Ligand binder design. Sequence first.
Ligand SMILES: [Ca+2]
Ligand SMILES: [Ca+2]
Ligand SMILES: [Ca+2]
Ligand SMILES: [Ca+2]
Ligand SMILES: [Ca+2]
Length: 312
Amino acid sequence: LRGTVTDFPGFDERADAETLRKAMKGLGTDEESILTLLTSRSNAQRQEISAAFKTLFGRDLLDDLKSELTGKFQKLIVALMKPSRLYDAYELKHALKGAGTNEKVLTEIIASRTPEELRAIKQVYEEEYGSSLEDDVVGDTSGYYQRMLVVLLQANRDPDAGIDEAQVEQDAQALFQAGELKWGTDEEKFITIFGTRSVSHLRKVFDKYMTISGFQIEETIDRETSGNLEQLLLAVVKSIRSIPAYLAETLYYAMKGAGTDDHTLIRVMVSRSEIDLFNIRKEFRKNFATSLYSMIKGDTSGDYKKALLLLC
Ligand SMILES: [Ca+2]
Ligand SMILES: [Ca+2]
Ligand SMILES: [Ca+2]
Ligand SMILES: [Ca+2]
Ligand SMILES: [Ca+2]
């Protein structure tokens, strides 16, 4: 896992505070200055620039960036400024909050994050927002989608140790028979297989599944659309195989067709900039025969594409 953003060598929080102050101060705004500085500092350095900005000027850097900037560019800079430890929990709170629910952010983050990451997300969510992530998810979702989400939210998959092939055989069968009935009959049985087994066990299951049916499990669950639970099952199957591959694909489908899902583009670009965006880049090129760069550049404009291309 290699990230695309790294600590800037020779950082001076005070110098960077003053540069940012100068870019904003007075009539107008110098976005080029802001943009090139904040995509080359790490998230933790940005936090030190904010601290230093308030000691020197008594102003809040994020409110100033929200006042001075506009549109998708403002959305991206505000996302970059969010402390890394708060961001997935923030995005989770905003998919739940209000009327309806953005199931896409819920599935994405709960299926692509590791048990370590989730233990930490549930802790910072509680701290920050006062309610349990579990109680807000249950407050907002229904049926087996809710159940599988809660199962994944316990952050208790089995450990990667004994490949119990008897259990590999049995679970492969169970999934096969669940596959043919289009993931609509024994939901309890497969929610436990998909949510509770080790990543190594399930990889061996997905293989034996293929030898039993001739094809890949995502083919049967595939309706890359329609039905919350199917969409989650597909996000889990793809993340068991490769989280950088699954994230590269949501990125791809954020730009394919008319429009752009700029919210997903900003969310995956920002949240993974210092975790695995390099690996996601590799996966993108290899699976889609285009680089992430080229697609971003075709699908985005202005200061917002300059900043994205610098984070890519
Ligand atoms: Ca100004
Ligand atoms: Ca300007
Ligand atoms: Ca503004
Ligand atoms: Ca809601
Ligand atoms: Ca498009």
